[PDB]
Design a protein around this ligand. Sequence first.
Ligand code: MG
Ligand code: MG
Ligand code: MG
Ligand code: MG
Ligand code: MG
Ligand code: MG
Ligand code: MG
Ligand code: MG
Ligand code: MG
Ligand code: MG
Ligand code: MG
Ligand code: MG
Ligand code: MG
Ligand code: MG
Ligand code: MG
Ligand code: MG
Ligand code: MG
Ligand code: MG
Ligand code: MG
Ligand code: MG
Ligand code: MG
Ligand code: MG
Ligand code: MG
Ligand code: MG
Ligand code: MG
Ligand code: MG
Ligand code: MG
Ligand code: MG
Ligand code: MG
Ligand code: MG
Ligand code: MG
Ligand code: MN
Ligand code: MN
Ligand code: MN
Ligand code: MN
Ligand code: MN
Ligand code: MN
Ligand code: MN
Ligand code: MN
Ligand code: MN
Ligand code: MN
Ligand code: MN
Ligand code: MN
Ligand code: MN
Ligand code: MN
Ligand code: MN
Ligand code: MN
Ligand code: MN
Ligand code: MN
Ligand code: MN
Ligand code: MN
Ligand code: MN
Ligand code: MN
Ligand code: MN
Ligand code: MN
Ligand code: MN
Ligand code: MN
Ligand code: MN
Ligand code: MN
Ligand code: MN
Ligand code: MN
Ligand code: MN
Ligand code: MN
Ligand code: MN
Ligand code: MN
Ligand code: MN
Ligand code: MN
Ligand code: MN
Ligand code: MN
Ligand code: MN
Ligand code: MN
Ligand code: MN
Ligand code: MN
Ligand code: MN
Ligand code: MN
Ligand code: MN
Ligand code: MN
Ligand code: MN
Ligand code: MN
Ligand code: MN
Ligand code: MN
Ligand code: MN
Ligand code: MN
Ligand code: MN
Ligand code: MN
Ligand code: MN
Ligand code: MN
Ligand code: MN
Ligand code: MN
Ligand code: MN
Ligand code: MN
Ligand code: MN
Ligand code: MN
Ligand code: MN
Ligand code: MN
Ligand code: MN
Ligand code: MN
Ligand code: MN
Ligand code: MN
Ligand code: MN
Ligand code: MN
Ligand code: MN
Ligand code: MN
Ligand code: MN
Ligand code: MN
Ligand code: MN
Ligand code: MN
Ligand code: MN
Ligand code: MN
Ligand code: MN
Ligand code: MN
Ligand code: MN
Ligand code: MN
Ligand code: MN
Ligand code: MN
Ligand code: MN
Ligand code: MN
Ligand code: MN
Ligand code: MN
Ligand code: MN
Ligand code: MN
Ligand code: MN
Ligand code: MN
Ligand code: MN
Ligand code: MN
Ligand code: MN
Ligand code: MN
Ligand code: MN
Ligand code: MN
Ligand code: MN
Ligand code: MN
Ligand code: MN
Ligand code: MN
Ligand code: MN
Ligand code: MN
Ligand code: MN
Ligand code: MN
Ligand code: MN
Ligand code: MN
Ligand code: MN
Ligand code: MN
Ligand code: MN
Ligand code: MN
Ligand code: MN
Lengths: 44, 271
Amino acid sequence: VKRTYQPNKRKHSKVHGFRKRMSTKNGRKVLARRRRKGRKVLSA
Amino acid sequence: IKKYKPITNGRRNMTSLDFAEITKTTPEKSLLKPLPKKAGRNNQGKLTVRHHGGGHKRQYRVIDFKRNKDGINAKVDSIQYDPNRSANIALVVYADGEKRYIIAPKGLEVGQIVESGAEADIKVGNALPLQNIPVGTVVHNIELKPGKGGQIARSAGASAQVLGKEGKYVLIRLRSGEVRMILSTCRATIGQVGNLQHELVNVGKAGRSRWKGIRPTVRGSVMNPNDHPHGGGEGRAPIGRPSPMSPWGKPTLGKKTRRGKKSSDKLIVRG
RNA sequence: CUACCCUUGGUCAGGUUGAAGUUCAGGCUGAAUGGAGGACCGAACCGACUUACGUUGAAAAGUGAGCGGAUGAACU
RNA sequence: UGAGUAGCGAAAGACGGGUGAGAAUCCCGUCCACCGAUUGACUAAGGUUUCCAGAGGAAGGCUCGUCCGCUCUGGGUUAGUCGGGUCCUAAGCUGAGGCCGACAGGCGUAGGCGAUGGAUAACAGGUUGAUAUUCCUGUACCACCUAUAAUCGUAUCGAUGGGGGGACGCAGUAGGAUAGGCGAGCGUGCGAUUGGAUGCACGUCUAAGCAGUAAGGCUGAGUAAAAUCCGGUACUCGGGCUGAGCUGUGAUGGGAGAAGAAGUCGUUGAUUUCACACUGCCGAGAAAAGCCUCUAGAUAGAAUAGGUGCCCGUACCGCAAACCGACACAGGUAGUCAAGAUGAGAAUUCUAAGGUGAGCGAGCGAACUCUCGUUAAGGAACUCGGCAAAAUGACCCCGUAACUUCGGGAGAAGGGGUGCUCUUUAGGGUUAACGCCCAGAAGAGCCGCAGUGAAUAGGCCCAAGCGACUGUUUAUCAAAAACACAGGUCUCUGCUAAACCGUAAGGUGAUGUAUAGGGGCUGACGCCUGCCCGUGCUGGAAGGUUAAGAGGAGUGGUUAGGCGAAGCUACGAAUCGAAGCCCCAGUAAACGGCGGCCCCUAAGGUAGCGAAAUUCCUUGUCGGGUAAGUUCCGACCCGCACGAAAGGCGUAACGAUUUGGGCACUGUCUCAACGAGAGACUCGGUGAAAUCAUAGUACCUGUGAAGAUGCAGGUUACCCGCGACAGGACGGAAAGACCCCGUGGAGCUUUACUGUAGCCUGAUAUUGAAAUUCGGCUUUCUAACCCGCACCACUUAUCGUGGUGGGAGACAGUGUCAAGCGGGCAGUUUGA
RNA sequence: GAAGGGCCAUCGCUCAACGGAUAAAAGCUACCCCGGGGAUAACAGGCUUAUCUCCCCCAAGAGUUCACAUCGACGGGGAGGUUUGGCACCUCGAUGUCGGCUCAUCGCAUCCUGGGGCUGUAGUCGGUCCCAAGGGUUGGGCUGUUCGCCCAUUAAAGCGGUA
Ligand SMILES: [Mg+2]
Ligand SMILES: [Mg+2]
Ligand SMILES: [Mg+2]
Ligand SMILES: [Mg+2]
Ligand SMILES: [Mg+2]
Ligand SMILES: [Mg+2]
Ligand SMILES: [Mg+2]
Ligand SMILES: [Mg+2]
Ligand SMILES: [Mg+2]
Ligand SMILES: [Mg+2]
Ligand SMILES: [Mg+2]
Ligand SMILES: [Mg+2]
Ligand SMILES: [Mg+2]
Ligand SMILES: [Mg+2]
Ligand SMILES: [Mg+2]
Ligand SMILES: [Mg+2]
Ligand SMILES: [Mg+2]
Ligand SMILES: [Mg+2]
Ligand SMILES: [Mg+2]
Ligand SMILES: [Mg+2]
Ligand SMILES: [Mg+2]
Ligand SMILES: [Mg+2]
Ligand SMILES: [Mg+2]
Ligand SMILES: [Mg+2]
Ligand SMILES: [Mg+2]
Ligand SMILES: [Mg+2]
Ligand SMILES: [Mg+2]
Ligand SMILES: [Mg+2]
Ligand SMILES: [Mg+2]
Ligand SMILES: [Mg+2]
Ligand SMILES: [Mg+2]
Ligand SMILES: [Mn+2]
Ligand SMILES: [Mn+2]
Ligand SMILES: [Mn+2]
Ligand SMILES: [Mn+2]
Ligand SMILES: [Mn+2]
Ligand SMILES: [Mn+2]
Ligand SMILES: [Mn+2]
Ligand SMILES: [Mn+2]
Ligand SMILES: [Mn+2]
Ligand SMILES: [Mn+2]
Ligand SMILES: [Mn+2]
Ligand SMILES: [Mn+2]
Ligand SMILES: [Mn+2]
Ligand SMILES: [Mn+2]
Ligand SMILES: [Mn+2]
Ligand SMILES: [Mn+2]
Ligand SMILES: [Mn+2]
Ligand SMILES: [Mn+2]
Ligand SMILES: [Mn+2]
Ligand SMILES: [Mn+2]
Ligand SMILES: [Mn+2]
Ligand SMILES: [Mn+2]
Ligand SMILES: [Mn+2]
Ligand SMILES: [Mn+2]
Ligand SMILES: [Mn+2]
Ligand SMILES: [Mn+2]
Ligand SMILES: [Mn+2]
Ligand SMILES: [Mn+2]
Ligand SMILES: [Mn+2]
Ligand SMILES: [Mn+2]
Ligand SMILES: [Mn+2]
Ligand SMILES: [Mn+2]
Ligand SMILES: [Mn+2]
Ligand SMILES: [Mn+2]
Ligand SMILES: [Mn+2]
Ligand SMILES: [Mn+2]
Ligand SMILES: [Mn+2]
Ligand SMILES: [Mn+2]
Ligand SMILES: [Mn+2]
Ligand SMILES: [Mn+2]
Ligand SMILES: [Mn+2]
Ligand SMILES: [Mn+2]
Ligand SMILES: [Mn+2]
Ligand SMILES: [Mn+2]
Ligand SMILES: [Mn+2]
Ligand SMILES: [Mn+2]
Ligand SMILES: [Mn+2]
Ligand SMILES: [Mn+2]
Ligand SMILES: [Mn+2]
Ligand SMILES: [Mn+2]
Ligand SMILES: [Mn+2]
Ligand SMILES: [Mn+2]
Ligand SMILES: [Mn+2]
Ligand SMILES: [Mn+2]
Ligand SMILES: [Mn+2]
Ligand SMILES: [Mn+2]
Ligand SMILES: [Mn+2]
Ligand SMILES: [Mn+2]
Ligand SMILES: [Mn+2]
Ligand SMILES: [Mn+2]
Ligand SMILES: [Mn+2]
Ligand SMILES: [Mn+2]
Ligand SMILES: [Mn+2]
Ligand SMILES: [Mn+2]
Ligand SMILES: [Mn+2]
Ligand SMILES: [Mn+2]
Ligand SMILES: [Mn+2]
Ligand SMILES: [Mn+2]
Ligand SMILES: [Mn+2]
Ligand SMILES: [Mn+2]
Ligand SMILES: [Mn+2]
Ligand SMILES: [Mn+2]
Ligand SMILES: [Mn+2]
Ligand SMILES: [Mn+2]
Ligand SMILES: [Mn+2]
Ligand SMILES: [Mn+2]
Ligand SMILES: [Mn+2]
Ligand SMILES: [Mn+2]
Ligand SMILES: [Mn+2]
Ligand SMILES: [Mn+2]
Ligand SMILES: [Mn+2]
Ligand SMILES: [Mn+2]
Ligand SMILES: [Mn+2]
Ligand SMILES: [Mn+2]
Ligand SMILES: [Mn+2]
Ligand SMILES: [Mn+2]
Ligand SMILES: [Mn+2]
Ligand SMILES: [Mn+2]
Ligand SMILES: [Mn+2]
Ligand SMILES: [Mn+2]
Ligand SMILES: [Mn+2]
Ligand SMILES: [Mn+2]
Ligand SMILES: [Mn+2]
Ligand SMILES: [Mn+2]
Ligand SMILES: [Mn+2]
Ligand SMILES: [Mn+2]
Ligand SMILES: [Mn+2]
Ligand SMILES: [Mn+2]
Ligand SMILES: [Mn+2]
Ligand SMILES: [Mn+2]
Ligand SMILES: [Mn+2]
Ligand SMILES: [Mn+2]
Ligand SMILES: [Mn+2]
Ligand SMILES: [Mn+2]
Ligand SMILES: [Mn+2]
Ligand SMILES: [Mn+2]
Ligand SMILES: [Mn+2]
Ligand SMILES: [Mn+2]
Ligand SMILES: [Mn+2]
Ligand SMILES: [Mn+2]
Ligand SMILES: [Mn+2]
Ligand SMILES: [Mn+2]
Ligand SMILES: [Mn+2]
C-alpha cells in the first residue's frame, strides 16, 4: 500500500530546515530549546 | 439555438447557443490578451465564499471599458467571442490605428464608424454622456462615476432606457427595475447588448457546468448539525425552525441584505 | 498519508455505433461524404460488487477467481 | 511452561567436475524447466558505498555455507557542447518604502526567488576488475580572446524602452517520409536412425556540412499610441517569401562472420515515432526571456592560424534483497524501449533479445483443511437467497418483440457456417502487367467423437419497487433507495453589491455587473401542483409602551446668625427621548394546519395514487402463477397513520440496486465417490507464541455462592507416549459496548438559565456657516472629514504619498455611553 | 454632627423536592467516552408455581331407558417444572444470543408396532382405559422463522428434558 512518508529532499529541508526554522520567531524558539537540550542532531 | 437530438442521455436536452453571429475571427487579437490565473479561494488560502472553482483556462480579453477617445471614428473590424463577459465582444479599429475592444450591442455591423467622443450621434453605437442624449433612448454601458468608464449595464442582454432627465444628475430606469438617478455628464453607450438567446441555453449534460466555473453544491437539509442549521434529523426531514436559514445562522428566504445608512440612499426611488 | 484547490507536465493496444453539417433524387425519407458522444465491447490504468482463502496472516485492510469505469465530473 | 510444538514468506530441478576441515545450498559444466507489454533493457524520486578485487565465516542470512547487499584490507564516480548554476518566467514564497495593527506581528507596491514548463553549441566507435555523449581514435560545433583586412569616416554596437516572433485547447480523417518487421551474394557445413542434397546464421555504417524537398502556411511601395526608416491604420500598381519531415553526397576508415595457423542487393509489408500541420468542435485554451527588428542614446575599425572555456551531479539499487512498508515482507512506486509466430490488437498460447530456477530439505502418498479435475440416474429437490460452480463466448451469414423521449430497446430472443487437400478465376494496391503482399467467390473430394479441435472472448427472457441517466460516498464491517446532477422555483443583491475570510488593513466575489452573483428548497422528462393568514418575513407606523442623555421643581446632612440664608455636598420627577414590541395589512415552490352523531380553530385534503420502503389488526378480500405460494403480481377500499416542490402520478433508456417468475445449465442438493497438488504425518536442520496460584487433575447421584477434576457416598481405573475429535475446564483474548450508578466527561438541540461575536437604532465628541413655526424639527452653502475615479509627480510601478480637478458633504466613519436583535458562539443547570 | 451600623418590635418565601445548593436554569446521543456494580435489569441456572401442561375427587346432567360406553356443569384436591410471570441467589477484570445444519443422548404423560379390560364391541373398522420405551417416527410449497396452513406419501408422521 501507499504509506505515510514518501521521502523528498527539498520538501524535507523546506518546512524543517535551519533556514525555515530561523525564518519564524517560533522556529527560533525551537532552535533555542534544542540547543538548550544539547542536541547534536539539532535541526536538519 | 442549436437543439441537439438525444444521441444519448444527458445530451437529452442540450441547447448550446447558435453561434451564427460569432462570424468573423475565431482567434481574437494578441495585443489585448494577458494572463488570467483562476482561484476559488481568497488570500490567506482559506476558502472564502465559494460554491465554485475548477474549470477550463480562460483568456482575459481586455474590454476597452472607458470608451475614452474623442472625435475619432473606428472600423469595428471583427465580432470575435469572449468567455468571461458572457456576451461576445466586437473589435473596433480606431482611426489612429491602435485597435480596441468594445462590448458588442444588438444590431451589430461589420463596419460602422460610430461614436468615441463628446460629439453626439444618437444612432446606436457608443459615446455620449448623461448631460447629452434624448429621454428614453436605449443605452448599454452606463457610468456610475465620471471618468471611471462605466460598469452599470453590461452582461448578455442589456437595457435601461434613459427614463427622463433633470437636475445635476439625470434619472434612468435599470434592468432590475430600480429607477436610479445616476450623475449627469457621465458616458453612456447607446443600445441593448448581445445574446437575447443566451438565457435559453440549457447545459443538459452534468459537468459541462463543471467545464464552466461551477462545481457541485450540497444542500442544507442533508449534512449534519455541526455543519449547518438545517443539518441532522433521522430520515429526510423538513426545515424545522421557523424561517429557513443559510449556513452561519442568518435567515435566507425573506430578510433584506441592503446596508443601513448607505451613501446611495439619496439617489433612486423604488425597485 | 488524506480532502479540496491553484501552476505545469504525462498517459489511455485495439475493435463497434454513425449526430449535426455537407452532397444528389421528392412537395421532413433513400444514398455518398462526414466523424458527434460524461456513447458501446474490451487491455493498459484507475476502482473495490460477490466469493473463497487468509485471521499469534506474506500483509496493523491483503491474495486468487470473477466484477465496475476506461475521451472523461478521466486517471496522476 | 506451552515444545522439540507452530512457522521457515507464492516456482523445477537433475547429474557430473571442482574447492574445502566440512557441500542438497559456493564455483564450472551439460541437460532441463520459468518470464518474455516482462522476472528483459534504460532512467526520475528516494537510498547513500550497498559498486570492484583479494581475502574471511564468530554474529546478520528464517536450513547449510567454502557463499553473500555480512567482516577485514585495498580501490573506485574524469564533461565548453548531457541534467542543473553563471538564462527565462507561472502558482506560490519572500517583499525597500508603505497600509494596518495590545505586543509578538499580519498584509502588500517595487523588485527579487522559484521548474514540473520556455531558450540552450557533438557524434560514431574502442577500451577497464569497478567509469564513460565525461577517458581516446576519428570526425565536428558553440562562445571568447589575440594576430590579418577586400570594405567605412563630427561603417559597426545598439538598450532597463516599445513592436514582431516565441505562443500554446480538445477531437478526427487521410497522406508524405522514416525506424523496426518478413521472404529469395555472404561466410560454414553436408549429417551413421528409414529418407534427401539443403541446413544455419547476416544483408550495418553517427552527428556535424554540401545539394533539394509541394507535405505546410502566407502578396508587393507613398504617407499620418509621447523620441523612429519599424509597428499599426488607407488610397494607387498582376507565379516568390517563411518553414520543412526525409532523401542523395561527402564524412569512409570504423562496424562485421563463421575458424583455419572477406558481405552490404532486391522485394514486400509499415506504425504508437516525424506536425496542433490540416479539418471540425466550444468549454474559446500561461508567462517571460533567447531570437528578428526599429528608434532614443553609444562608439577611433567590424573567411584566416594559435590558443581560453568555470562550479554541481556522474559509483551501485532503481516493479526492488539496496526506495516507502519494524523483516532479504505475495503490498506501493512517475517515465522511456519493447522483437517472432497467431491475431482486430500492447488480448491469448508458445518463443527472441535478455533474464531467473525465488535461502530449508529428504520421505511417505493416513484423517482433516485448502487449490484444482471428473462423475451413474435425477436437475434447484439445496438454500434466507441458484451463494458457489456449471452454462454462453471468436469471426462471416442470415434473423430479430412489447415499448419509445424515434436516438433507442439490440449483441434482444435466436438459426446456419468454421478443419485439411485439389481444381477452376473474378476485386483490390505496389510495380517494366514478371512476384510480393491480402483474400475472397464456385465445384469435387479426404479425416476424426468432435474443425474458433488448445488458450483467451456475452448467458438470456418475463414482471415489480426505488432512483432519470455517466458520476460521488463511510481510507480499514454499509456503494445504496444516500449525495451529486441538468431542469424547476423562491429569496436577497444597483456595485467600495451582497455573501463569505480577518481585530483590522488587505482579499474573495470578480479584470464580474441583474440573461450576473450569494442563499434556501426540489431534482431529467411528461401530466400537474388543491384548501387555510399563530410564527417568520415584508410593508405600515394614528395611538400605548420603552434606555443613556437633556432637564430641575422639590427632598435630606452640615453651620453664618429651636428656626435654620449662602457655600460645597449626598439624592431627585414633570416634560423632551430612536429602533424594537403591542396593534394593521400582505405573503404558503415561507415555518406550518385533519373534530362528533343515530359541532369549533384561520381551514378541516381537489387531481392522483392506496392494504404501499407508508397497513396495526394481517397470511385482510377476490383472482393470477404452483401439486402446494405468510413472498410475488392484478384488482378491490373503513388510507391503524398516502397526497401534490420533505413535490403527486406515470415514464423509454440506464443499474456489481431490492423483489418475484422462467429457458438453459449444473456436485447446491438426493449422496456421496475417485483422482492431482499444498499443509498435516515419519526423518535431518532451525526453532517462536498467547496462557500459566501449586498440582499426583475420573464418572454418577448429591452437597454448596442455589450448574463441582479437587466436598459427601458409591461406582470405575496398571505405568508412559503418538495420531485424532471438541463436551467441559462457567476454556484464551478485551477491568461489558446493553442495563444502572457518579451531585463523571464530551458532542448535539431548543421559546432551559446566564451570557457573548456581530448587526440595527439613539445621545455625545470629532463637528463649521446660514435661512422661517418656538436652542428643536426640516432645508442651503464650504475650510473639517470621505473616496475600491480622473489626469501630475515622487516613479521604466493600479501600493501608498503628496498634489490639482471632480463627487459626497457636517451625513458618514471611527471613539465613549445606551437600548433592542442575537444557539452564530460559549459556560453550565436539567432532584431524590 | 451626619452617612452608616448594633439592640429591641415587626413585615417581605406553594423556598410545597417544605433542615430551605444559586438572585438566575430544559432537552438529545444509535457518533459516543471514563470511573464503577452481579449492590441492579435483559439470557441461562436456582427458589416459587399465580399462569401453564397433565391428573384426579363429587356427580347435577347429556347419552330413547341407564350419571359412571362416551362426554362431565357448579364446586373440591393434587402432580409436573416444557410457558408467561414473581424473587434478584451465581456470573457485569463478558456464563455468545433465534431458527437451521451436524451429531446425538435421555424421560414417558406412547404417534406406530407387541399384549390386554370395557364397549352404546355382529364382521371389517373404531372409541376409551391398562401393560409396554425394543425399534421406528417421511419428502416438498410458503415464512428468518420456531409455530402454523397446505401438497403428496406413511405402520406412524408422538410429546418433552439435555445452558
Ligand atoms: Mg454533447
Ligand atoms: Mg445540490
Ligand atoms: Mg436526514
Ligand atoms: Mg456496460
Ligand atoms: Mg503461507
Ligand atoms: Mg579434496
Ligand atoms: Mg548547462
Ligand atoms: Mg564565477
Ligand atoms: Mg509584494
Ligand atoms: Mg513595528
Ligand atoms: Mg539497473
Ligand atoms: Mg528471500
Ligand atoms: Mg470438485
Ligand atoms: Mg440480500
Ligand atoms: Mg466458467
Ligand atoms: Mg443487431
Ligand atoms: Mg406501479
Ligand atoms: Mg411491494
Ligand atoms: Mg477584488
Ligand atoms: Mg411510490
Ligand atoms: Mg406487514
Ligand atoms: Mg409524505
Ligand atoms: Mg410513482
Ligand atoms: Mg506433504
Ligand atoms: Mg514446507
Ligand atoms: Mg473438547
Ligand atoms: Mg461501538
Ligand atoms: Mg450538557
Ligand atoms: Mg440500591
Ligand atoms: Mg426450567
Ligand atoms: Mg425413543
Ligand atoms: Mn452547453
Ligand atoms: Mn446525513
Ligand atoms: Mn447548529
Ligand atoms: Mn432540522
Ligand atoms: Mn420522518
Ligand atoms: Mn485508439
Ligand atoms: Mn464511455
Ligand atoms: Mn477484497
Ligand atoms: Mn464494501
Ligand atoms: Mn482482482
Ligand atoms: Mn474490468
Ligand atoms: Mn467497458
Ligand atoms: Mn490534473
Ligand atoms: Mn517429533
Ligand atoms: Mn521437525
Ligand atoms: Mn501440542
Ligand atoms: Mn502436530
Ligand atoms: Mn511443519
Ligand atoms: Mn522461501
Ligand atoms: Mn560447522
Ligand atoms: Mn548452473
Ligand atoms: Mn514459457
Ligand atoms: Mn539520487
Ligand atoms: Mn559485491
Ligand atoms: Mn557458520
Ligand atoms: Mn546459519
Ligand atoms: Mn572533449
Ligand atoms: Mn519594512
Ligand atoms: Mn526541467
Ligand atoms: Mn527544456
Ligand atoms: Mn556499471
Ligand atoms: Mn559512447
Ligand atoms: Mn469527442
Ligand atoms: Mn550460399
Ligand atoms: Mn544428424
Ligand atoms: Mn540412413
Ligand atoms: Mn551509471
Ligand atoms: Mn517486495
Ligand atoms: Mn501506479
Ligand atoms: Mn514504470
Ligand atoms: Mn508483438
Ligand atoms: Mn499479423
Ligand atoms: Mn501476455
Ligand atoms: Mn537466452
Ligand atoms: Mn480425502
Ligand atoms: Mn479443527
Ligand atoms: Mn491453517
Ligand atoms: Mn467440464
Ligand atoms: Mn452427475
Ligand atoms: Mn449425465
Ligand atoms: Mn433439465
Ligand atoms: Mn441430462
Ligand atoms: Mn425450495
Ligand atoms: Mn428444504
Ligand atoms: Mn426476503
Ligand atoms: Mn454467481
Ligand atoms: Mn444473438
Ligand atoms: Mn462442413
Ligand atoms: Mn467421419
Ligand atoms: Mn442512480
Ligand atoms: Mn453508476
Ligand atoms: Mn473511493
Ligand atoms: Mn468501508
Ligand atoms: Mn473592506
Ligand atoms: Mn431531495
Ligand atoms: Mn434620566
Ligand atoms: Mn442648602
Ligand atoms: Mn403546497
Ligand atoms: Mn388538513
Ligand atoms: Mn419456487
Ligand atoms: Mn392466493
Ligand atoms: Mn399489491
Ligand atoms: Mn409542501
Ligand atoms: Mn421525488
Ligand atoms: Mn426453476
Ligand atoms: Mn494429495
Ligand atoms: Mn512468554
Ligand atoms: Mn504462586
Ligand atoms: Mn487418569
Ligand atoms: Mn462453603
Ligand atoms: Mn442445593
Ligand atoms: Mn445439584
Ligand atoms: Mn457433579
Ligand atoms: Mn494427545
Ligand atoms: Mn466453551
Ligand atoms: Mn467494569
Ligand atoms: Mn431498559
Ligand atoms: Mn450518565
Ligand atoms: Mn424566535
Ligand atoms: Mn451621532
Ligand atoms: Mn491622491
Ligand atoms: Mn450592547
Ligand atoms: Mn437577548
Ligand atoms: Mn450550548
Ligand atoms: Mn467548570
Ligand atoms: Mn434514581
Ligand atoms: Mn441611624
Ligand atoms: Mn428534605
Ligand atoms: Mn432548589
Ligand atoms: Mn442511523
Ligand atoms: Mn466501561
Ligand atoms: Mn452478592
Ligand atoms: Mn431469569
Ligand atoms: Mn450459570
Ligand atoms: Mn407444584
Ligand atoms: Mn384446582
Ligand atoms: Mn444478585
Ligand atoms: Mn434481599
Ligand atoms: Mn475472568
Ligand atoms: Mn471467557
Ligand atoms: Mn405408562
Ligand atoms: Mn421405544
Ligand atoms: Mn427429542
